[PDB]
């Protein structure tokens, strides 16, 4: 929209349920809950840029290694995909190479070591794209 | 029947009946709701959790002057069954419930008499918190 025609409004909040969303989900979830938990508002800029930051409680499946219990180190992954659109429709990109810890609450039992994120393609498929956080 | 369907359409016609509005008449009056709990079974009384589960029928009776009709004009029909979800209900709930389920379990029909009297007897499985004495 043109800000000058709407009292110089630069961004507005629209419900995320009434705008097109890329159905990005936690593909490797372990409890059957794929979507986010709240479906908050999406902040829309006057140039058409959408910024959506919904919270979510996720339960992902992990391959627990027990050989060195109780001095063990686990490598649990979260794989994100759009269960509606393939790579020929939407392309997933990483805003950053690592997950953000800006508002993290220390666990007490588990120590965080690294949270890298990687964007994976399938050279054999060409319709597969995902982002995995280790 | 055609007459019964016509009556049902006439009563719940949204252009003349708004279920979000209390059936208050004579001015700033209040609607008197009659309650009666009928205990059908005492399913369990957990002591560790301090929760009593019951199977009850929660009788509820009030008068809705907006659901009145003349039996003569409707084949001498004295009462009709309306879906409880489409009429005004007093949101009577189990306030002290455990497990956070306030409303009834089934939402049966409401038996409505021609004079506006309503009769709703929904079943419910209720989990209420209570203080257990262990002495």
């Amino acid at each position: 929209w043109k800000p000058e025609e709407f009292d110089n409004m630069k961004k507005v909040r629209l419900p995320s349920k009434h705008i097109w969303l890329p159905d990005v989900v936690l593909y490797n979830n372990a409890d059957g809950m794929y979507e986010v938990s709240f479906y908050s508002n999406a902040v829309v800029s006057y140039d058409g840029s959408i910024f959506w930051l919904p919270p979510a409680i996720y339960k992902s499946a992990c391959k627990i290694e027990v050989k060195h219990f109780p001095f063990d180190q686990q490598n649990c992954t979260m794989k994100f995909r759009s269960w509606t659109y393939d790579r020929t429709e939407i392309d997933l990109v990483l805003k950053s190479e690592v997950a953000s810890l800006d508002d993290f609450t220390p666990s007490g039992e588990w120590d965080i070591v690294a949270l890298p994120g990687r964007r994976n393609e399938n050279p054999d498929d060409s319709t597969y794209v995902d982002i995995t956080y280790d | 029947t055609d007459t019964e369907e016509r009556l049902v359409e006439h009563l719940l016609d949204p252009s003349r009946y708004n279920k979000l509005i209390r059936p208050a008449t004579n001015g700033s009056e209040l609607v008197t709701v009659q309650l009666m709990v009928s205990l059908a079974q005492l399913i369990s009384v957990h002591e560790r959790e301090q929760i009593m589960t019951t199977n009850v029928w929660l009788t509820q009776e009030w008068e809705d002057y907006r659901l009145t009709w003349k039996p003569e004009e409707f084949d001498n029909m004295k009462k009709v069954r309306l879906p409880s979800k489409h009429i005004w209900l007093p949101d009577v709930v189990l306030y002290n419930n455990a497990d956070g389920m306030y409303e009834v379990s089934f939402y049966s029909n409401a038996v409505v008499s021609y004079d506006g009297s309503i009769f709703w007897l929904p079943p419910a499985i209720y989990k209420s918190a209570c203080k257990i004495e262990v002495k």
């Binding site: - | 029947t1 007459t3 019964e4 369907e5 049902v8 359409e9 719940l12 009928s38 059908a40 079974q41 399913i43 369990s44 589960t53 199977n55 029928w57 009788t59 084949d75 029909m77 069954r81 309306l82 879906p83 489409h86 379990s105 089934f106 049966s108 029909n109 038996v111 007897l121 079943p123 499985i125």
Partner: protein, 286 residues
């Protein structure tokens, strides 16, 4: 000429002015005869401690609707169609003795509608009902759990239930290996409640099930008997051995454990005491 056009043509005609909130009878005095029957798919759980029975059933229903009628000659000789169950009036048959479950049918599969108005509806259901548990002869016990079905808001003068068949269908029953159905018969009843001045009919199904007593005999009975065999040996043990107290103390603490294990299987009802509980207790006293 085509079905997806003729059937679509038929569907539009049926649901043009259809009211799903009205009893489907051409005359007020008529009775909606609902043929009710049950077909058990499996007996998921027979929990004795909680005195509840979980079952998987197909709630066979069948009734006549006078508005959903047509002449097949007019619609390319279409005799029956499948229609949504949430768009048509349905009887409100609920399970009276529901415990930790759903009162009514909550799945709402499609219904089969025939050209003469007959509607066949066979939705699946998982019912968690409450039944009294008698464990006097456990593990050789034979339980009798009942399910009561009936219309909730229509009396016998408006909706009447007809026994589809006396016996619960068992052609597709899934054998679990722990319970065996001896018989399961639906009985038609009518009675008056203090709520209302009319007679409300109901159909009660009585599932008489028998437990196969070879697991708990192998795993509870024989281990209990073997310890009971050692009850008397303490009196043949010479005192100089200095092991008399060890033998009888061990026997006592073993029988006590077995009693608690059984205590966690049987219901906490105080009307009857199991024969196994009596035997263990008396051995503990001796």
């Amino acid at each position: 000429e085509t079905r997806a056009h003729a059937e679509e043509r038929l569907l539009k005609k049926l649901f043009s002015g259809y009211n799903k909130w009205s009893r489907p009878v051409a005359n007020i005095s008529d009775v909606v005869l609902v043929r009710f029957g049950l077909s058990i798919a499996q007996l998921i759980d027979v929990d004795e401690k909680n005195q509840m029975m979980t079952t998987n059933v197909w709630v066979k229903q069948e009734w006549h609707d006078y508005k959903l009628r047509w002449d097949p000659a007019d619609y390319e000789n279409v005799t029956s169609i499948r229609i949504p169950s949430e768009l048509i009036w349905r009887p409100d048959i609920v399970l009276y003795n529901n415990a930790d479950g759903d009162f009514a049918v909550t799945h709402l599969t499609k219904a089969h509608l025939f050209h003469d108005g007959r509607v066949q509806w066979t939705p699946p259901a998982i019912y968690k009902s409450s039944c009294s548990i008698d464990v006097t002869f456990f593990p050789f016990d034979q339980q009798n759990c009942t399910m009561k079905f009936g219309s909730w808001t229509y009396d016998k003068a408006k909706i009447d239930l007809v026994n589809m068949h006396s016996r619960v269908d068992q052609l597709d029953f899934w054998e679990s290996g722990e319970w065996v159905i001896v018989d399961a018969v639906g009985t038609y009843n009518t009675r008056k409640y203090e709520c209302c001045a009319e007679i409300y009919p109901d159909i009660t199904y009585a599932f008489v099930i028998r437990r196969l007593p070879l697991f708990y005999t192998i795993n509870l009975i024989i281990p209990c008997l073997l310890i009971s065999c050692l009850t008397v040996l303490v009196f043949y043990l010479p005192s100089e051995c200095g092991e008399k107290i060890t033998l009888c103390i061990s026997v006592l603490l073993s029988l006590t454990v077995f009693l608690l294990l059984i205590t966690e299987i049987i219901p906490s009802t105080s009307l009857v005491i199991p024969l196994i509980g009596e035997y263990l207790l008396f051995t503990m006293i001796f």
